[PDB]
Amino acid sequence: GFCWHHSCVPSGTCADFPWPLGHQCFPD
Amino acid sequence: GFCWHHSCVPSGTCADFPWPLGHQCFPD
């Protein structure tokens, strides 16, 4: 997961970012 | 901006993260 700007997402989250990141997941 | 997985997206980009983080943009 991670925390951004006062909210967090859990382990195993993925999200679509602009390129060059594209689809990324957040193991912690 | 936002850096992850050896890449960065530029200032002024956004992404949809799961609740509760939701829709966020990346000032730097």
DSSP string, B1-28: -EEETTEEEPTTEEEEPPTTT-EEEE--
Residues of B in contact with A5 (CB under 8 A): 24
Rounded CA-CA distance A7/A20 in Å is 24
Q: What is the count of structural domains for chain A?
A: 1
- CA B16 vs. chain centroid, Å, equals 8
Cβ distance B14 to B26 under 8 Å? yes
Terminal-residue alpha carbon distance, chain B:
4
Q: How far apart are CA A16 and CA B17, in angstroms?
A: 8
User: Are A22 and A15 contacting, i.e. CB atoms less than 8 angstroms apart?
Assistant: no
Q: Closest Cα partner for A21 from B21, B6, B26?
A: B6
Q: Do B24 and A13 lie within an 8 Å CB cutoff?
A: no
From B2, B20, B14, B4, select the one nearest A24 (Cα to Cα): B4
* Domain ranges, residue A28: 1-28
